[PDB]
Amino acid sequence: GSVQIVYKPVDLSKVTSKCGSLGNIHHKPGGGQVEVKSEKLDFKDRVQSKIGSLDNITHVPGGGNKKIETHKLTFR
Amino acid sequence: GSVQIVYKPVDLSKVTSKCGSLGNIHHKPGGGQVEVKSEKLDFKDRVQSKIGSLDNITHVPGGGNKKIETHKLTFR
Amino acid sequence: GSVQIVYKPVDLSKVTSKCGSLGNIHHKPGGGQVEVKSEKLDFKDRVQSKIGSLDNITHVPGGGNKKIETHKLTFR
Amino acid sequence: GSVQIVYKPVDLSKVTSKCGSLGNIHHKPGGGQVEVKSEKLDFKDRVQSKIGSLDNITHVPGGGNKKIETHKLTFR
Amino acid sequence: GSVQIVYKPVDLSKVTSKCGSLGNIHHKPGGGQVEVKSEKLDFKDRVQSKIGSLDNITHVPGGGNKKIETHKLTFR
Amino acid sequence: GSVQIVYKPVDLSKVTSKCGSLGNIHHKPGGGQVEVKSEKLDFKDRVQSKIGSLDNITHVPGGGNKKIETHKLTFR
């Protein structure tokens, strides 16, 4: 019973993005107000909490192409 | 029972980004107010908390291409 | 039972980013106010907390391409 | 023609206010945003302008009784 | 023609205010944003302008009673 | 023509304010942002301008009673 696995992917890809000019981006928030009123937290595993986070972002890349992959062979 | 694994991926890829000019980005937040009122925290594992984080970001890269990958062979 | 593993990935990739000029980035926050009111913390493992962090960032790289990878062979 | 004026008002008044206790007043605005876009102003007399005034007030007096009066004899 | 004026007001008044206790007043604004964009101003007389005034007030007097009066005899 | 003026006001008044205790006043603004963009000002008389004044006040007197008066006899 010669188990045999020849796992062999190939990949010849491209993720291009040609752009002319990024200009005149304004972003002027106006404050606000948050108020959490809790008692206890008991986080236990892989928790990713964000309690009462008033914030702003301006993510303006000239690129932004993401090519995520994943492989796995859970042999038993 | 000669178990055999020939795990062998290939990758010939490209993630390019041609851009002209990044200009005139303004980002003028206006404050705000946060207020958390908790009692106890009992974080226990891999916790990633952000309690009451008033903040701002301006992430303006000339690139930004991300190529994440992952492999695994959990043999038993 | 001559177990055999020939784990052998290849990688011929590129993550390029051609840009013209990064210019005229302004970032003028306006303060704010935070107030946490807790009693006890009992962090225990791999905790990554940020309690009441009022802050700002201006991350403006001429690059920014990230190529993360990971491999693993948990043989038993 | 002995013109005669015997202008003579009297006033025996009271403006009282008995109160027990002023307590637990909260006032938590949430920001906002204004934007005026004008060209010219040409104010000329007794003008009382307030252009684009984002503001807040908390006027909590233990009194507040106002007794305004006015007299006049424009004789000719 | 013996013109005669006997202008003679009297005033026996009171503006009282009895109060118990002023307590627990909170006032927590949350910022905001204003933007005026004008060209010329040409104020000329008794002008009282307030252009783009973002502000806050907390006027909490234990009194506050105002008794304004005015008299005049513009004889000709 | 013996013009005669017997201008003679009287005033027996009181503006009292009895209070118990002023306590626990909080006032926690949260910033903001103003921006005026003008070219010329040409103020000429008795002008009282306040251009772009971001500010705060906490006027907490134990009194505050104001008794303003005015008299005038513009004889001709």
Side-chain angles (χ1 to χ4, degrees):
Chain A
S2 280
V3 178
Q4 169 197 22
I5 300 183
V6 191
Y7 184 94
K8 181 191 50 185
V10 195
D11 194 321
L12 279 73
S13 63
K14 42 195 305 169
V15 184
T16 82
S17 165
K18 319 181 179 183
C19 174
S21 72
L22 286 74
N24 210 342
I25 292 91
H26 303 212
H27 177 180
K28 327 166 72 165
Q33 170 149 11
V34 190
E35 168 175 349
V36 188
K37 192 162 310 186
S38 71
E39 303 317 298
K40 315 182 177 188
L41 323 186
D42 204 324
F43 305 173
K44 280 267 167 43
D45 192 339
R46 278 173 170 277
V47 183
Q48 313 200 15
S49 172
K50 295 185 48 184
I51 299 191
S53 89
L54 191 155
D55 51 61
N56 307 107
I57 304 190
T58 307
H59 177 100
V60 187
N65 311 123
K66 321 154 53 180
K67 181 169 175 307
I68 315 185
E69 294 204 24
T70 296
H71 301 248
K72 176 168 304 189
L73 281 85
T74 302
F75 191 102
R76 307 288 280 259
Chain B
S2 280
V3 178
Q4 169 197 22
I5 300 183
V6 191
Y7 184 94
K8 181 191 50 185
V10 195
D11 194 322
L12 279 73
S13 63
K14 42 195 305 169
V15 184
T16 82
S17 165
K18 319 181 179 184
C19 174
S21 72
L22 286 74
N24 210 342
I25 292 91
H26 303 212
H27 177 180
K28 327 166 72 165
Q33 170 149 11
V34 190
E35 168 175 349
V36 188
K37 192 163 310 186
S38 71
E39 303 317 298
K40 315 182 177 188
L41 323 186
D42 204 324
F43 305 173
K44 280 267 167 43
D45 192 339
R46 278 173 170 277
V47 183
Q48 313 200 15
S49 172
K50 295 185 48 184
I51 299 191
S53 89
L54 191 155
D55 51 61
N56 307 107
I57 304 190
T58 307
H59 177 100
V60 187
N65 311 123
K66 321 154 53 180
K67 181 169 175 307
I68 315 185
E69 294 204 24
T70 296
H71 301 248
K72 176 168 304 189
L73 280 85
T74 302
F75 191 102
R76 307 288 280 259
Chain C
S2 280
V3 178
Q4 169 197 22
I5 300 183
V6 191
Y7 184 94
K8 181 191 50 185
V10 195
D11 194 322
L12 279 73
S13 63
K14 42 195 305 169
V15 184
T16 82
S17 165
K18 319 181 179 183
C19 174
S21 72
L22 286 74
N24 210 342
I25 292 91
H26 303 212
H27 177 180
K28 327 166 72 165
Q33 170 150 11
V34 190
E35 168 175 349
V36 188
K37 192 162 310 186
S38 71
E39 303 317 298
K40 315 182 177 188
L41 323 186
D42 204 324
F43 305 173
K44 280 267 167 43
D45 192 339
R46 278 173 170 277
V47 183
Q48 313 200 15
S49 172
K50 295 185 48 184
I51 299 191
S53 89
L54 191 155
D55 50 61
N56 307 107
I57 304 190
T58 307
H59 177 100
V60 187
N65 311 123
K66 321 154 53 180
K67 181 169 175 307
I68 315 185
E69 294 204 24
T70 296
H71 301 248
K72 176 168 304 189
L73 280 85
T74 302
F75 191 102
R76 307 288 280 259
Chain D
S2 280
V3 178
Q4 169 197 22
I5 300 183
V6 191
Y7 184 94
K8 181 191 50 185
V10 195
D11 194 322
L12 279 73
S13 63
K14 42 195 305 169
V15 184
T16 82
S17 165
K18 319 181 179 184
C19 174
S21 72
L22 286 74
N24 210 342
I25 292 91
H26 303 212
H27 177 180
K28 327 166 72 165
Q33 170 150 11
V34 190
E35 168 175 349
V36 188
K37 192 162 310 186
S38 71
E39 303 317 298
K40 315 182 177 188
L41 323 186
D42 204 324
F43 305 173
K44 280 267 167 43
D45 192 339
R46 278 173 170 277
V47 183
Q48 313 200 15
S49 172
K50 295 185 48 184
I51 299 191
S53 89
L54 191 155
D55 51 61
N56 307 107
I57 304 190
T58 307
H59 177 100
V60 187
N65 311 123
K66 321 154 53 180
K67 181 169 175 307
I68 315 185
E69 294 204 24
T70 296
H71 301 248
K72 176 168 304 189
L73 280 85
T74 302
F75 191 102
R76 307 288 280 259
Chain E
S2 280
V3 178
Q4 169 197 22
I5 300 183
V6 191
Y7 184 94
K8 181 191 50 185
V10 195
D11 194 322
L12 279 73
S13 63
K14 42 195 305 169
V15 184
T16 82
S17 165
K18 319 181 179 183
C19 174
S21 72
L22 286 74
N24 210 342
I25 292 91
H26 304 212
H27 177 180
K28 327 166 72 165
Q33 170 149 11
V34 190
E35 168 175 349
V36 188
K37 192 162 310 186
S38 71
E39 303 317 298
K40 315 182 177 188
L41 323 186
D42 204 324
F43 305 173
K44 280 267 167 43
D45 192 339
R46 278 173 170 277
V47 183
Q48 313 200 15
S49 172
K50 295 185 48 184
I51 299 191
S53 89
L54 191 155
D55 50 61
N56 307 107
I57 304 190
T58 307
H59 177 100
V60 187
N65 311 123
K66 321 154 53 180
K67 181 169 175 307
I68 315 185
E69 294 204 24
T70 296
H71 301 248
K72 176 168 304 189
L73 281 85
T74 302
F75 191 102
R76 307 288 280 259
Chain F
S2 280
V3 178
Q4 169 197 22
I5 300 183
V6 191
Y7 184 94
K8 181 191 50 185
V10 195
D11 194 322
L12 279 73
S13 64
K14 42 195 305 169
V15 184
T16 82
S17 165
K18 319 181 179 184
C19 174
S21 72
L22 286 74
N24 210 342
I25 292 91
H26 303 212
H27 177 180
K28 327 166 72 165
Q33 170 149 11
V34 190
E35 168 176 349
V36 188
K37 192 162 310 186
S38 71
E39 303 317 298
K40 315 182 177 189
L41 323 186
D42 204 324
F43 305 173
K44 280 267 167 43
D45 192 339
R46 278 173 170 277
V47 183
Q48 313 200 15
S49 172
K50 295 185 48 184
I51 299 191
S53 89
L54 191 155
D55 51 61
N56 307 107
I57 304 190
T58 307
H59 177 100
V60 187
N65 311 123
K66 321 154 53 180
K67 181 169 175 307
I68 315 185
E69 294 204 24
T70 296
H71 301 248
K72 176 168 304 189
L73 280 85
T74 302
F75 191 102
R76 307 288 280 259

